[PDB]
Amino acid sequence: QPTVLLLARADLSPVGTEFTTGPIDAHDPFDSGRRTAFVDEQGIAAGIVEFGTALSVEAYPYTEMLVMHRGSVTLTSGTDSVTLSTGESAVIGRGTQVRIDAQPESLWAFCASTQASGPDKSGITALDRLALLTPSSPPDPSIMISPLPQCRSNNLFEDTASTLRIGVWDSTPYERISRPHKIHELMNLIEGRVVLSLENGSSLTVNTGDTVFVAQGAPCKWTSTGYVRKFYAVT
């Protein structure tokens, strides 16, 4: 029953979303800290991680994107080091030798590809909120209510171990009809706000600094009345 799931609010207010605590599978380096909101049969998972110590992983088992909501994490792999504070994001490629060093009481949203579908692209990739973007495809004209927007993106990470493309996107305002989502999508809003109207006839307002996950097949209407900029992970 694919749906739209609010993973975390900017102010860490309660979300309606149910999370399953524990490792996603027998390879997950996280367990008590892993809070999974969604996993599909083909291995895409989304949720949050609560963690407050360091752990080292010899070969990271997933391709995994982290979006910080509280605290701080420093990711180290050999001579590479990336520190993420609230609002910052990075990707751990599949196979990366990585140390994940969280300050106490840290919390991040995640999207992981837990199934490999091609060769590892290992390493850590930081994702700049202010990345420079180039024109990207608006929605299908046939589903539009408003005029077509101008959209831009930058695929800062293009996996070869999955179909994940991860980056930054922006758009002028638009409105379209409800459609089942064509792909899996994590979004974290850098600027603006969007209203997602849902299969059950309810509404989710995604505000600046919130992270939401839209499962493939989830019926979703998009309405934005202003500019939106987001981090994304899409399959």
Name the site residues for Cl ion (rule: CB under 5 A): 30-33
* Nearer of residues 30 and 232 to Cl ion, judged by Cβ: 30
Q: Nearest approach, Cβ of 31 to Cl ion (angstroms)?
A: 5
Task: Say if CB 65 and CB 45 are below 8 A apart.
Answer: no
Closest to Cl ion by CB, 51 or 157? 51
Closest CA to 192 of 167, 221, 223: 223
Look at phi and psi of residue 228 and say left if phi exceeds 0, alpha if psi is from -120 to 50, else beta. Answer: beta
Using CA atoms, how far apart are residues 83 and 102, in angstroms rounded to an integer? 10
Task: Give bridge partners of residue 49 from the DSSP assignment.
Answer: 34, 108
Comparing CB distances to Cl ion, the nearer of 57 and 183 is 57
CA distance 90 to 218: 26
By the 10 Å C-beta count (0-12 exposed, 13-18 middle, 19+ buried), 26 is classed as exposed
- The residue type found at 206 is V
Residue 123 beta carbon to Cl ion: minimum distance, rounded to whole angstroms: 23
Nearer CB in complex with Cl ion: 31/191 = 31
State in angstroms the smallest separation of the CB of 28 from Cl ion: 9
Contact present, 73 and 66 (Cβ < 8 Å): yes
Phi first, then psi: what are they for 20, rounded to 5°? Answer: -95, 125
Least distance to Cl ion from the beta carbon of 80, Å?
Answer: 23
* Helix (H) / strand (E) containing 20: strand 20-21
Q: How far apart are the C-alpha atoms of 91 and 1, rounded to whole Å?
A: 28
Q: Which is nearer to Cl ion, 31 or 140 (CB)?
A: 31
Rounded to the nearest whole angstrom, what is the least distance from the CB of residue 19 to Cl ion in the complex? 13
Nearest residue (CB) to Cl ion, 30 versus 174: 30
Minimum gap (Å) between residue 30 Cβ and Cl ion: 4
